[PDB]
Ligand binder design. Structure first.
Ligand SMILES: [Rh+]
Ligand SMILES: [Rh+]
Ligand SMILES: [Rh+]
Ligand SMILES: [Rh+]
Ligand SMILES: [Rh+]
Ligand SMILES: [Rh+]
Ligand SMILES: [Rh+]
Ligand SMILES: [Rh+]
Ligand SMILES: [Rh+]
Ligand SMILES: [Rh+]
Lengths: 173, 173, 173, 173, 173
C-alpha cells in the first residue's frame, strides 16, 4: 500500500491501532492476575488457569486486529504498554470484579469502533467486529457475571471456605 | 373418523384435550424455571439443566397424549396456554417446591382421567396411562422429594454455600 | 445484572420478549398443523412430518432468543400463548398458505427488531439476528413458496390425486 | 391341572377358546385376501403383502391366547373354522373396508373379554389383553383408517390409476 | 509460436475461436435455464439440475477447444458473449425444445468445422472433434429427444400433473 487500500479511513486505522494497544494491555493484566494466583501464599490453581487462558485470548484478539489492519492496507503502529493497574489482586472476588471492569472497557471500545466504522461507511470493519469480537465479548462477560454471582453466594461467614470451594468445583479442570 | 373410533367416549376425548393443555402448561413453566436459573444474577447451571430437561419431558408427554387421541379417532383441540405462575422463582428450594406442587397436580389429573376411563369401561385408555404416565410421574415425584430433602438439609446457617454445593454435587452432570 | 448489562436498551429487551412469544405461538401453530395431518380422515404423513419439524425449529428459535436475552443481562418475561388461528387446517394447499403467512409475520417482526437495534445503536443484536434468524427465515419462505407452486400445479381437475402425489413424492422421507 | 389353575373361571376359559376361533378365522380371511390380490387379473403385489402379513399376525395372536390358556391351566378346545365371508374381494378399497370391519369385530371381542375378566376379578387376564392385544388392535385400526382415507382420495375420476398408485407408493416395500 | 505451429490453417484457427464463442453462449443459455427453474413460481429442482449440469458441460467443451487451440499454436481470441435468447423459458417442454435446437446448432457447427479440417487436410483436428465432441453431442441429443417424447406423452389433459411427474420420476436424482 497504498496499492490495496480501499474504503479504509485514517480514523479507523488509528482506532484499530488503539484497540490493539488495549487488547495487549488486557493480555498483560491477565498475565499479572494469573501469576498472582500462582503465589505460594495465594495458591488457587483454577483461578491462575482461568486468567492465563484469558491472557492468551486477549493476545489472540490483538493479533486478529493486526492481521486485519494489514489486510486493509493500514499500518500497524505500536505504543508503550502500560503496566497493569495493580501489583496484588486481592481475593478471587476482587480479581473477578477487576476482570469484568476490564472486559466492559474492551467491549465499549469495540462498540465505539463499530460506531466509527458505521459513520465511515465501512461494512468490512463492521462485519469483522461482529464476526470475531462482539459476541465473544458478550459471552465472556456473561461467564464472568455468572462467576461473580457464585463467588458472592459463597462468601457467607466462611470466606476462605467459599474461595476454596469455588476454585475446586467451578474453576479447576 | 368417525371411521375408526370405537369405545372412545366424548368425555374421555375432552379430558385428554384438557390434559394436553396441562402438560404443555407444565412444559412452559419448566422453560421459565430453566431460563431463570440461567440469569447472570442467579447462575446455577445444574438447576437450568434439571428444569430444561423437565420442559422437554412434559412436551413429550403432551405429544404422546395427542398421538393417542388420533389413534383412537378423537380430535385434538388446543386452547390458550396460560403463562407460568411466577416470573421469578426464588431459591432452588422455592423452585423445587413449586415443581413438586406442579407434578402432584399433573398426577392428580392423570388419576382423575384413569378414574373416568375406568367408569367409561375404556381399558385401552387405562393401560395407556399406566404404561407411559403413572409410573413416570411417581418416579419423578420421588426424585423431587429426594432433592427437596437434600436441599433442606443444606440450608443450615449458610444458605448460599448449601445452594452452591447442591448444584455442584447433585445436579450438575 | 444489572452487573453485565451494557448497551442493551429496555426497548430491545421488551421487543425480544415479544418475539419469543411470537416464536412460541408459531411453534404451537405448527404442533396443531402436524397433528391435524395425523388424523385418520386426513392421513398425510409427509405433511405431519413437515409441520412437526417446523414446530421444533420455532421452539429452538425462541430458546436462542431467550439465551441471548440472558447473555445481554435482559430479563425473560413470558406471556400467555394464544391458541392457533384454526382447529382444522383444510387441504395441504390451505395449510401451506397459512404457514407462509405465519413465516412472513415472523420475518417482519425480525426486520422490525433489526430496525429497532439499528436505531438503538446495538450491533450485537443486529449481528445476532443476521447470524441465526434472517437468512433461515428467507430460506424457509423460499422452500414454502416452492412447495406452494408445486401443490398449485398438482390441483388440476384431480385434487385428491395431486395431494397424495405431492405428499408421497416431495414431502415424505 | 387342575394342579395349577387359580382364579381362572370357566367363563373366561370358554371366552378365550372363542377368541382363538375368531383370530384363526381372521387369519384365514387374510389368507384369502392375500391370494385374491395375487390373481393374474388383479395383480397388486403390495396389497397381497399387506394382507399376508396380517394373516401371520392374527395366527400369532391365536397362538399367544392358546399359550396363555395353558399357562392358566385352562384347556384349549378347537372348533370348525368357517370359511371367509367372500370368495372375491373387489377393489383395494372394498378389501380395506372389509378388513377394518373384521378388526373392529376382533377389538369388540377383546373388549368383551376384558369386561368379563374385570367382572370375574381376573387381573392377569386384564393385564395380558392390555399388554399384547388392545394397543396392537388400536394401532392396526388407525393404520387401516389412514389407508382407507388415502385410497378414497385417490378414486377421483381415474380409479384404476388411483389403485395402482396407492399400491406402488404406499403399500409396496 | 509461431515456434510450434504446423499444418494449422488460419481458417481452422478462426473457426475454433468462433466455436468457443458458441459453446460459451450455450453455457450462458443453460445458466439462465437453470436459474429460471429455480424461481419460486416455477420450482422444478430436477429441471434446474439438468440445465445446470449442461452449463458446466458446455463450459468444459469451450475449455477443451481453447486448450487445443494453444496446443496447435493458434491464438485464442474472445468476443462478446450475447445474452440468451429468452429471459423466461416457459414450460419444461418449451425449455427442452429450446435445448435441442441449441444442441443441433452446436452439432452443425462441429460438423462444419470437421468439414473445414478435412478440406484443410488437418487430421489432428478431425480426430480431436471425433474423440471429444461429435459422439458426446449425438448422445446428448438422443437423451433430449427421449426426454421430449416422455414430456409430450405426459401432457395429456393434466399438464401440471405431467410436468411434476416428469421432474420427480425422470429428472430428480
Ligand atoms: Rh481451561
Ligand atoms: Rh455491524
Ligand atoms: Rh441431564
Ligand atoms: Rh389401570
Ligand atoms: Rh425431515
Ligand atoms: Rh444487521
Ligand atoms: Rh411388510
Ligand atoms: Rh385392564
Ligand atoms: Rh445429475
Ligand atoms: Rh474425422
Amino acid at each position: 500500500s497504498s496499492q490495496i487500500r480501499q474504503n479504509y479511513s485514517t480514523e479507523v486505522e488509528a482506532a484499530v491501532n488503539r484497540l490493539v494497544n488495549l487488547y495487549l494491555r488486557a493480555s498483560y493484566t491477565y498475565l499479572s492476575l494469573g501469576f498472582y494466583f500462582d503465589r505460594d501464599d495465594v495458591a488457587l490453581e483454577g483461578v491462575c488457569h482461568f486468567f492465563r487462558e484469558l491472557a492468551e485470548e486477549k493476545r489472540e484478539g490483538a493479533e486478529r486486529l493486526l492481521k486485519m489492519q494489514n489486510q486493509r492496507g493500514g499500518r500497524a503502529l505500536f505504543q508503550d504498554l502500560q503496566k497493569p493497574s495493580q501489583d496484588e489482586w486481592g481475593t478471587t472476588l476482587d480479581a473477578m470484579k477487576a476482570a469484568i471492569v476490564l472486559e466492559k472497557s474492551l467491549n465499549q471500545a469495540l462498540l465505539d469502533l463499530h460506531a466509527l466504522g458505521s459513520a465511515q461507511a465501512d461494512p468490512h470493519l463492521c462485519d469483522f467486529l461482529e464476526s470475531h469480537f462482539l459476541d465473544e465479548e458478550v459471552k465472556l462477560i456473561k461467564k464472568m457475571g455468572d462467576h461473580l454471582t457464585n463467588i458472592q453466594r459463597l462468601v457467607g461467614s466462611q470466606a476462605g471456605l467459599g474461595e476454596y470451594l469455588f476454585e475446586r468445583l467451578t474453576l479447576k479442570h
